[PDB]
Amino acid sequence: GETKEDIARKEQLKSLLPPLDNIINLYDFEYLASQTLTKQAWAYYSSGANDEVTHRENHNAYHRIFFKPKILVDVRKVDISTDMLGSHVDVPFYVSATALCKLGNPLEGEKDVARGCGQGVTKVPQMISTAASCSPEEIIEAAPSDKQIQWYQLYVNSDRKITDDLVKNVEKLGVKALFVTVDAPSLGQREKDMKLKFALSKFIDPSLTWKDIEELKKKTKLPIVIKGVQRTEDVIKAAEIGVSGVVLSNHGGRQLDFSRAPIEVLAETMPILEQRNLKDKLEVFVDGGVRRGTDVLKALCLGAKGVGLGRPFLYANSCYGRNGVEKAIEILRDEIEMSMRLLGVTSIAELKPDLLDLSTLKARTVGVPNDVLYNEVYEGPTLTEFEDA
Amino acid sequence: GETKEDIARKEQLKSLLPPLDNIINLYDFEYLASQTLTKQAWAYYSSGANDEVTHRENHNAYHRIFFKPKILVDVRKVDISTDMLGSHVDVPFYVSATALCKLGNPLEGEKDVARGCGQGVTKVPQMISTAASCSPEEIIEAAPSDKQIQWYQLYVNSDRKITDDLVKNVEKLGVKALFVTVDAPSLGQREKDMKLKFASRALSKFIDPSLTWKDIEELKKKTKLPIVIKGVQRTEDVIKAAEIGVSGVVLSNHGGRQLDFSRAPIEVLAETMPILEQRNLKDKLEVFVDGGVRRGTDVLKALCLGAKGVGLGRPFLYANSCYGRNGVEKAIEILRDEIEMSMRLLGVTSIAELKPDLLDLSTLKARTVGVPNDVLYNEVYEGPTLTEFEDA
Amino acid sequence: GETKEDIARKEQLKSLLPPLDNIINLYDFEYLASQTLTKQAWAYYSSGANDEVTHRENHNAYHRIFFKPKILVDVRKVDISTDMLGSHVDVPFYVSATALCKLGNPLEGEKDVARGCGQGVTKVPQMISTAASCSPEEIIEAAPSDKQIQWYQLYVNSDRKITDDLVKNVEKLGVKALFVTVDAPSLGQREKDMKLKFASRALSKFIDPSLTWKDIEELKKKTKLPIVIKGVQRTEDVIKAAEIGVSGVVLSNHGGRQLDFSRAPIEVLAETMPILEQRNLKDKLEVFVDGGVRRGTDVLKALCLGAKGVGLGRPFLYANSCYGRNGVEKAIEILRDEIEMSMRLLGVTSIAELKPDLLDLSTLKARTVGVPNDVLYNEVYEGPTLTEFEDA
Amino acid sequence: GETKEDIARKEQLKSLLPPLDNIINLYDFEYLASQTLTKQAWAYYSSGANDEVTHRENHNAYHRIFFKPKILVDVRKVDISTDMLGSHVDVPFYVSATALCKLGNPLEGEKDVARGCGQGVTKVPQMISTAASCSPEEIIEAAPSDKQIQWYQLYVNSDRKITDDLVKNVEKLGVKALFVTVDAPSLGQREKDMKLKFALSKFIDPSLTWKDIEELKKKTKLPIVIKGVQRTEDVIKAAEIGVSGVVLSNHGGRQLDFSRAPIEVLAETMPILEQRNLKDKLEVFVDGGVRRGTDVLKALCLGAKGVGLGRPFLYANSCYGRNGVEKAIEILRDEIEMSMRLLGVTSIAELKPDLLDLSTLKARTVGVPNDVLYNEVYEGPTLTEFEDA
Numbered sequence A, D: 001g002e003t004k005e006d007i008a009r010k011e012q013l014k015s016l017l018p019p020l021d022n023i024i025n026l027y028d029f030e031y032l033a034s035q036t037l038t039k040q041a042w043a044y045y046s047s048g049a050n051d052e053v054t055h056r057e058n059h060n061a062y063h064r065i066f067f068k069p070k071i072l073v074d075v076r077k078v079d080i081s082t083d084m085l086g087s088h089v090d091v092p093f094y095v096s097a098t099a100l101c102k103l104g105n106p107l108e109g110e111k112d113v114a115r116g117c118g119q120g121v122t123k124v125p126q127m128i129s130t131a132a133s134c135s136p137e138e139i140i141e142a143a144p145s146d147k148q149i150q151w152y153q154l155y156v157n158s159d160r161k162i163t164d165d166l167v168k169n170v171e172k173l174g175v176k177a178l179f180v181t182v183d184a185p186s187l188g189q190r191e192k193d194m195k196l197k198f199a200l201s202k203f204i205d206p207s208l209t210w211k212d213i214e215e216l217k218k219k220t221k222l223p224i225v226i227k228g229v230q231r232t233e234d235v236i237k238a239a240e241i242g243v244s245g246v247v248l249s250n251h252g253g254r255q256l257d258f259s260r261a262p263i264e265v266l267a268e269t270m271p272i273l274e275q276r277n278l279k280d281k282l283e284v285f286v287d288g289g290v291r292r293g294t295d296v297l298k299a300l301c302l303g304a305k306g307v308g309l310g311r312p313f314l315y316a317n318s319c320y321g322r323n324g325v326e327k328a329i330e331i332l333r334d335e336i337e338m339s340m341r342l343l344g345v346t347s348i349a350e351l352k353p354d355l356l357d358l359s360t361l362k363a364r365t366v367g368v369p370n371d372v373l374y375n376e377v378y379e380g381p382t383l384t385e386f387e388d389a
Numbered sequence B, C: 001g002e003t004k005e006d007i008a009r010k011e012q013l014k015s016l017l018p019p020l021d022n023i024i025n026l027y028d029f030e031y032l033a034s035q036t037l038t039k040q041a042w043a044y045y046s047s048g049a050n051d052e053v054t055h056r057e058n059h060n061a062y063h064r065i066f067f068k069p070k071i072l073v074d075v076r077k078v079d080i081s082t083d084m085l086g087s088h089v090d091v092p093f094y095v096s097a098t099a100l101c102k103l104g105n106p107l108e109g110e111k112d113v114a115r116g117c118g119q120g121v122t123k124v125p126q127m128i129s130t131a132a133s134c135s136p137e138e139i140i141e142a143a144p145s146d147k148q149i150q151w152y153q154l155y156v157n158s159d160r161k162i163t164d165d166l167v168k169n170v171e172k173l174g175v176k177a178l179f180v181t182v183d184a185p186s187l188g189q190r191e192k193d194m195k196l197k198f199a200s201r202a203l204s205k206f207i208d209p210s211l212t213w214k215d216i217e218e219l220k221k222k223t224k225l226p227i228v229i230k231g232v233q234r235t236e237d238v239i240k241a242a243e244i245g246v247s248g249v250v251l252s253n254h255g256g257r258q259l260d261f262s263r264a265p266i267e268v269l270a271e272t273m274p275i276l277e278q279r280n281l282k283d284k285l286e287v288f289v290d291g292g293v294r295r296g297t298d299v300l301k302a303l304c305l306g307a308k309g310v311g312l313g314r315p316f317l318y319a320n321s322c323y324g325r326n327g328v329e330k331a332i333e334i335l336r337d338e339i340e341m342s343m344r345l346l347g348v349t350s351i352a353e354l355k356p357d358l359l360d361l362s363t364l365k366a367r368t369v370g371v372p373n374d375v376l377y378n379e380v381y382e383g384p385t386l387t388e389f390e391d392a
């Protein structure tokens, strides 16, 4: 580092930020946040586990899936709303649990996320971190609409007292569901943080069990989503104990490196749910690496009831507050609407597997290392040139 | 978004552009064009939809196909002519439609392509854009030969009167086919272009988003002109088109300018044609192909899988934009020569002889995404090294 | 080939080397070492055979394997201890043998690794090189714990007297196994090393090129020590070894320092073990594995495929070369911690629970060589772009 | 470019060339030749057809093949000699037809290649280009040994006169075989040449046929090798008309781009020759991309009776004359001898397929294009650092 070059920082965000309606991608947010946040706000957001392969593979795995679009379909009118978890929602995506948004947005934090999510026309669901820089309550009333649905993610404590008080507290406060993170019994090693800063907590119980969940069902009517599943064998398990849904997630490539990409697990497990009757029973959400509407459409096409994005909404918020979060919402809505149209379908229910080319899902390759010498002495062809005067 | 750079640019167009006979390949026009077109002519020509993957993948797919050349064949004499949509043509490729050719050739635009195509000993079909700078009237009158063939690319307006008028107008003017574009109900989001200026908006009256199979069936009744459905991205819609009895189809994703993650047309081609035999609709429907074609060996692969002809857009745009009409001819010339030589070395002498027995198709589906690599392992790794030369 | 650079270097060793507690991962020792070892200590440690592909591929192969973690498991308590060659050890990894440790730790060499291993709360087996700077006498006397275990890496001399003497000497000194290296009949050609100085020569008396199965069978008679054949590169020779009844085998290609295009040991492991069941030689032979292991998740994959333990060379070399003995301990410590955390998140609590049901093996064989790409297509292609920040 | 910077050139080759016994690879030759030859000597040597994919793929395809080496084998003694085409040879490799060696070696040319090939202990066969800068005769007596075998490659002319005189001429002059190039009916487009320089000949007949070959059998007793085959279907054909051998070759990636790699064709066709009895009948040689002994061993392992290298021997010769050519010979001999030893076999006849891992021969991949934006804003992990004073 922190270094009177948070003076160079304050230059950048000062007006030098381009007009919010010059932002095109979710990547644009990320570039801008990369240059401006404090070294440690940035480390904490961008960071992944160890060598960061899963964090990246989460994204790249969408690129193993292509489209077989229908043409000569009337797409004048398209509708991207659907139902997640009792409520009915405007988009098929949501903000996912990011902890500690005061590092990026100092004054307003995850209040400004709630503003963003129903301050404009489109109304998006919001997961709230158990490590929120704000209180659940602070957030929920910063909301500009009773129509905007909210969701609580929960680290069950080792004091089954404290976490019983929280479930009763959040019920009383509006939230229409409970998202129980289970992929962080030990917090993952994020070395970008450490290098600059120069793994069991009690906040998060590693004792957590299936039986402990079965019990969380009884103590509440709120729908329950085991957020952090990483194989088919445990989706089936969540069905077998009839929880509401499940997020296919690996905590944003932040827990176990070489966890697979949710999109690839998704594609494995939805066929297995039809082959066991369990289709209807479980909502199957999906996060990680999602940065474009075509990603969101691949997920939905495969079976996802809804798809979460974390870091992007941090980065937008971190840069442009609640307004950032909305533009980012609209950005993604427009991406989804156009690609649907070009896909040749008009509702989320028509987003099926027969729209996807899945022939190369499994082409997750590692090439043999480059012949250094052969390639150093090779000279490629050259483009024709121009001249003199 | 241009900046008395016009002089930096004009200075290169200026005699710095090398002689036309110094152009070896199609990639040269593309380079010359990148340095001399106006910032937004370049963005509009060069760009594709969103992250731009289909656009690139259209080309690279050609490279998952290899050859099984026949040796010891009398390849003295080679005929690259074939037939498209009922005309006989000199060449098994065509100039796909490309809107706004004045951005890069302000004086003559599409008229100069029409001359490039019909002027030389080798002449090539020209599809004309519905949203071309010039009039069809102007572009057709511009043609140097009666024998040269020009097709019409149609966007059906949502005011089907305007459209009925247009079709009537262009069959009167003597165009030989209608390429109705179906891959743009919403206009693709090309971000290099947007990044310069600074959802119902990317819909518009001028290209009807409700165009349907039933429409094309009616289009077919209202005209004697052969109809080609341009913009098909899956085998399912080639069959649908064989069923309404239309003359043909372009497997195409609009040069990667509409839907990202549309497959490479060559890939759709290769799965499509076998099915077109399995249901004996083989020669009931001419299947064209476009996107990412830049070499004559590219063309050969598509012909060997069964395409009736293969289209090119940006390369003719870039050639026309640096060298106007003799640019266009040079590219025809360059690509023609590529097809001829590669045909000899492939071991065939005609277009009808270009069949699948010549392709090695085994690695066609090796569309890979590698696992992200190990920035740290590679960071500290030091590679071998060449020997040196001493000191002085 | 060193050049009063020794000061440039000494200046970094100098207090510029960061505190040991600032080392996060094994790649850090490797970097620090690259800047501070003497030009030819670095070439001898870092180098591999010829174009160096196996050496790199040993690592990257680990990355064609992914995990199927078990969730909602009581992972409060985790035991990373297992058993090797009849001893019980704290940890499922070991320090493979590495010759000439004084090049990088001139004062103490192998003795410092022996202390790094036996000194802390967590202690780790040490294989000792036949061609180590120090004496076995010296390295064994250097050990901090009775409980710590040290193995002997044997090259059989072509004068089998010298060898008979050696084996006798080291069982007297209390080593717990003999790792006879069979992957160096000719010594691999490491060109970074050769490039500094400026076929019967790369053969030598000191490592007998005629070593045979019949020899190892006799070696086994002459000693009570468990024997491990170190350097096996195919399943066929694991079976041959189960047949002469030897205690075990290291699937290994010598850290990529002998034969280029030897397969990744993890790959040989994964095909080998299933066969070791199919012929019920499952627990008749302990299969170790080495090369390219740098993360605790690397170790886990090998354990999950059935390896009895997994070895590391260069990383302990580099750690010992920057930080001597507390370097070594830190790496043990670092790698141990990696294995523990990754075990929790994998959903298991012991080494016996690490089985194949946890690995995703489907893309294990996607060892690709991509087609050379299109320098010209990519040359003129311009990629999308991020938005900007204004001016001041 | 040609430009009184052939003055910078003459600097380099002047003594600045490292001692010939500081050369380790065939690549080292290539680097040195890259810096020294005239722009056009270099263009003409390095050049490939069009985009140069086949030229490169020729090499890289060896890297799809790995080894399953035998250990605990007595390899004290190894023997790499074998028989090619009547004669018995010291190595299993040979120099292949490179045309025009006076561009690189001005005074001595392909005479210095013949010196190189039997001037030292090991004695390697030499193909002589029909476009040799020297006469067949000039070369053959520049040879320092009657033991060193020679070979003539032949462009049949359209004047079946001129080429009938040549076959009778070369017979009379020693050459133990005839190599009929058939992959250049039209000369391939080499754009590196053209760019600096700013496709039917009669020298080379495109009328050439199978029947024309059948006839070349009768007019000579010299063994005949149809050099330039690129599919299995034509190896079979060469057998069917009982010619002696055949080179699996695509003229060094200089004729048809997207011709396959000879090593991959080799592996396809040798099984097909056993499955049709034709194993014994045909010698199957192999060139392209061969730069290391491990390449040469993969070929042999698969069935190759012998493996040709072109450009490397040009580059060595171009730099160090006949002495260059020998060192390059010995370099490759030592590579072959060591890797055999480490392979655990002692004669060329024991080099079989069971030594090779062929499971990924067919992993000739094209990856999907890189996500430019995602990768631009990504920041990798970073190595720990060092400090201050």
Ligand SMILES: Cc1cc2nc3c(=O)[nH]c(=O)nc-3n(C[C@H](O)[C@H](O)[C@H](O)COP(=O)(O)O)c2cc1C
Pocket: A044, A045, A046, A058, A096, A097, A098, A099, A129, A130, A131, A153, A181, A227, A249, A250, A251, A252, A253, A287, A288, A289, A290, A308, A309, A310, A311, A312
């Ligand atoms: C900065 C940071 C903090 C996070 N904190 C939590 C948390 O407390 N609980 C949780 O379940 N997920 C947490 N996540 C993960 C997400 O809810 C989500 O699973 C992840 O961000 C999805 O990946 P993405 O960022 O690529 O979209 C966090 C993610 C980030 C990047």
Ligand SMILES: Cc1cc2nc3c(=O)[nH]c(=O)nc-3n(C[C@H](O)[C@H](O)[C@H](O)COP(=O)(O)O)c2cc1C
Pocket: B044, B045, B046, B058, B096, B097, B098, B099, B129, B130, B131, B153, B181, B230, B252, B253, B254, B255, B256, B257, B290, B291, B292, B293, B311, B312, B313, B314, B315
């Ligand atoms: C600048 C630009 C304008 C285009 N305009 C049209 C158009 O108006 N109508 C149409 O049907 N296709 C249009 N296309 C698509 C092409 O006809 C063609 O499918 C594309 O150029 C094929 O890709 P390529 O540029 O890789 O060869 C356009 C393409 C470009 C690049």
Ligand SMILES: Cc1cc2nc3c(=O)[nH]c(=O)nc-3n(C[C@H](O)[C@H](O)[C@H](O)COP(=O)(O)O)c2cc1C
Pocket: C044, C045, C046, C058, C096, C097, C098, C099, C129, C130, C131, C153, C181, C230, C252, C253, C254, C255, C256, C257, C290, C291, C292, C293, C311, C312, C313, C314, C315
């Ligand atoms: C500098 C160096 C010296 C080695 N010396 C020996 C040796 O004397 N004997 C032996 O059996 N292995 C020796 N090895 C091989 C290792 O024991 C081990 O197999 C290798 O280090 C595993 O690869 P890694 O460095 O990727 O972990 C040596 C390796 C290195 C890098």
Ligand SMILES: Cc1cc2nc3c(=O)[nH]c(=O)nc-3n(C[C@H](O)[C@H](O)[C@H](O)COP(=O)(O)O)c2cc1C
Pocket: D044, D045, D046, D058, D096, D097, D098, D099, D129, D130, D131, D153, D181, D227, D249, D250, D251, D252, D253, D287, D288, D289, D290, D308, D309, D310, D311, D312
């Ligand atoms: C400079 C140059 C000239 C060549 N001239 C001929 C020729 O006249 N006839 C022929 O059959 N091959 C000719 N070749 C090809 C070779 O004999 C051989 O097939 C090729 O060089 C093998 O590939 P490599 O250089 O990668 O080893 C030539 C190759 C080069 C590089």
Ligand SMILES: O=C(O)C(=O)c1ccccc1
Pocket: A099, A131, A184, A251, A254
């Ligand atoms: O940052 C995180 O990934 C996270 O999940 C978390 C959980 C609890 C407290 C702080 C952060």
Ligand SMILES: O=C(O)C(=O)c1ccccc1
Pocket: B099, B131, B207, B257
């Ligand atoms: O730019 C284009 O790709 C295009 O086809 C088009 C279509 C209609 C209007 C403008 C451009």
Ligand SMILES: O=C(O)C(=O)c1ccccc1
Pocket: C099, C131, C207, C257
């Ligand atoms: O350097 C080596 O890899 C090695 O193992 C060794 C073996 C014998 C002598 C010297 C080094």
Ligand SMILES: O=C(O)C(=O)c1ccccc1
Pocket: D099, D131, D184, D251, D254
């Ligand atoms: O250079 C060549 O590839 C070649 O084969 C050749 C053939 C005849 C004359 C000159 C060159």
